[model samples]
Target: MKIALTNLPPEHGERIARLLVEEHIVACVNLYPVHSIYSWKGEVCSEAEVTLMMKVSTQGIERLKQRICELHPYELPEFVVIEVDNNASLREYIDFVKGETHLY
Candidate 1:
């Protein structure tokens, strides 16, 4: 299984999350309001955004990346993937993630 993170603008966050799940590319998406501070085009930027934490199967990782880019409004959206150590994760939850996401 894989866990992916993406910060999206307030407006587009829920829409993107729904699309990913509706398509079966991601098993679950947890959204939270976040305050983000970063650098862009040389200047520091601060904004309010939604943190989209997604649970995905290994097989769906690539598709999730592509789908996020396609559905996101930002010119450069965040699509950070985290490798979940199988040994450290719950067996049943991992199985559910893998089973929920589309294969191939």
Candidate 2:
């Protein structure tokens, strides 16, 4: 299984979750509200952001990135993908993701 992390606006989290599942890009998308402190444009910044945990298959990575980029409000949205080892049920859940929709 592949997992991805992205920072999104709090309000956009719900919409993003729905889109991923509806579009068959992910089995599940978990959201967590967080306070982020980081450097950008040579300065320190702090803000409230929602962290999105997207679960998808390896084959879907590129398309998932493109879809997120298209839906995201940020010019440079955070997208981090990771490999995961999951239990049988979770693995099945991931499999279900691929069946959610038929998109050419």
Candidate 3:
């Protein structure tokens, strides 16, 4: 299993999270509000956004990225992936994630 992160307007959070789960790309997602500061177009920018922390099956990683690109409002949405160390995780929960997400 893997954890994928992406941030978008708070309004788009739940909808996108639902779509990914409904489409079987991700097993689950947690959304949380965050204050962000970054550079865009050579200027520093600050914004409030919702970060999506997605639980994905290893097999679904590639498809998850593609689906996010199609569904995300941002042209370059964050797609950072963190590999889960199952040895340090609950086995049953990891099994649930793998079972819920797509095999493709």
lDDT of each residue in 1-104, candidate 1, tens digit only: 98999999999999888988888999999999999999999999999999999999888898899898888888898999987898789999999999999955
Give lDDT tens digits, candidate 2, residues 1-104: 57899998888977888888887787788989999998899999898889989877667778888889999988788999876765644656767755553345
Q: What would you estimate as the lDDT of candidate 2?
A: 0.80
Clashing pairs in 2: none
lDDT of each: 0.92, 0.80, 0.91
> What ranking of all candidate models by lDDT puts the best one first?
1, 3, 2
Which segments of candidate 3 are over 4 A away from where they belong? none
Candidate 3 C-alpha lDDT tens digits along 31-79: 9999999989899989999999999988889999888899889867888
**On a 0 to 100 scale, what is the lDDT of residue 6 in model 1?**
99
Instruction: Estimate the lDDT of model 1.
Output: 0.92
Q: Show the colliding residue pairs in model 1.
A: none
| RMSD list, candidates in order | 1.0, 2.4, 1.1
Model 2 root-mean-square deviation: 2.4
- In model 2, the Cα lDDT at residue 2 comes to 72
